[PDB]
Amino acid sequence: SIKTPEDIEKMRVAGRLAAEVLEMIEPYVKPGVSTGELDRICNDYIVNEQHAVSACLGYHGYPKSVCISINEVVCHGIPDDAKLLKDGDIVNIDVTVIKDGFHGDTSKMFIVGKPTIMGERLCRITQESLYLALRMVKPGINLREIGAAIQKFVEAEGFSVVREYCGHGIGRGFHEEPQVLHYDSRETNVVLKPGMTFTIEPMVNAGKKEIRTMKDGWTVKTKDRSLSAQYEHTIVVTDNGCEILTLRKDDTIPAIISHDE
C-alpha cells in the first residue's frame, strides 16, 4: 500500500525507536554476556523507557523480544540465558518495535572482542550490500533490479545471498506486501512508487547460500555452518529517492537519499 504523510511520520517515530534500541545495546555486547540478558535489556528499554512494545513477542509464537543470531546462525536466533558471547563472535541483534500502531524494523552486526579478519570482512560487505540497495531506491526502479544488484555485489565480493528470507513491506502490519528479495528472481515485478514503506535486510553467507531450519521453527543456520551476516533498515520511498527511518549514529550513509540535482 501507499502510506500517507501521517502514516510516514508515525513510522519515523517507530523506526527511530528501533534504531535507538540498537544504539543503546551496543556497550552490552561483550564477551561473557548472555543473549538472554541482552534480550531483557532491550525489552526493558522498549517497554519502560520508550513506552512501546516488541512486535516479536508472540508473533507466530516467538518467545522473546528481539532476535539475536550468532556466527553460523542466519536469522531469528532466540535469546537464551545459557548462551554466552565470546571473542570473535559476530552477532546480529534484530529489533522490531511497535509505537502508535506502526512498526520499526532494523538490525546490525556486532563483533565481540577481538575480531576475526573474515568476520569483519563478511559484516563489511553485508552492510555495503544494504547501502548499495538503499542508494538505488527511488520511484521507477523495480524491486527485481534491487535484488539483482545486491546479489551481483555480494557474489562479486566472494559471498552468497540467502534466498529463503527477504525484506518486506511494513506499516501497521509487521510484514506486508511486497516481498523484497535480495537476489534476482523472475517472480519479482514491482515498480517502486512514492509512499511505499518496506525493509531491505540481506543475509549474506561466507560460504554457500543453503540454509537449514532448527527444530524450534525459528533458528536458521547455514547448511555448511559458515558465517552469516545481516543488516536491516526500514525505509519509505520518496518522490525522488528514499528516506531511511531506522538510521543510527554509526551508519555511514545519510537518512535521506535524493537523486535530484
**Stretch touching ligand NLP by CB under 6 A, among 8-16, 56-64, 140-148, 186-194:** 56-64
C-alpha separations of 171 from 10, 74, 239 in Å: 9, 24, 19
Q: Does 94 bind Mn ion (CB under 5 A)?
A: yes
Residue 182 Cβ vs ligand NLP, minimum distance, rounded to whole Å:
12
| Of residues 69 and 160, the one with the C-beta less far from Na ion | 69
Q: Could you give the dihedral angle defined by the CA atoms of residues 122, 128, 132 and 133, in that order, rounded to the nearest 10 degrees? A: 60
20 binds, among Mn ion, ligand NLP, Na ion, none (CB under 5 to 8 A by kind): none
228 binds, among Mn ion, Na ion, ligand NLP, none (CB under 5 to 8 A by kind): Na ion
Dihedral sign for Cα atoms in the order 76, 196, 23, 227? positive
Please give the DSSP secondary-structure letter assigned to residue 46: I
Give the list of residues 6+ apart from residue 22 with CB closer than 8 angstroms, or none. Answer: 93, 95, 106, 107, 108, 248
94 assigned ligand-binding residue = yes
Cβ-based neighbour number of residue 174 at 10 Å:
16
Please give the DSSP secondary-structure letter assigned to residue 47: I
105 assigned ligand-binding residue = yes
Please give the DSSP secondary-structure letter assigned to residue 224: T
Name which position in 96, 205, 226, 228 contacts Na ion (CB under 5 A). Answer: 228
80 assigned ligand-binding residue = no
Amino acid present at 120? E
Name which position in 2, 49, 59, 214 contacts ligand NLP (CB under 6 A). Answer: 59
Name which position in 199, 228, 238, 246 contacts Mn ion (CB under 5 A). Answer: 199
Q: Does 56 bind ligand NLP (CB under 6 A)?
A: yes
Q: Where along the sequence are the contacts to ligand NLP (CB under 6 A)?
A: 56, 59, 62, 67, 75-76, 94, 96, 105, 165, 201, 232
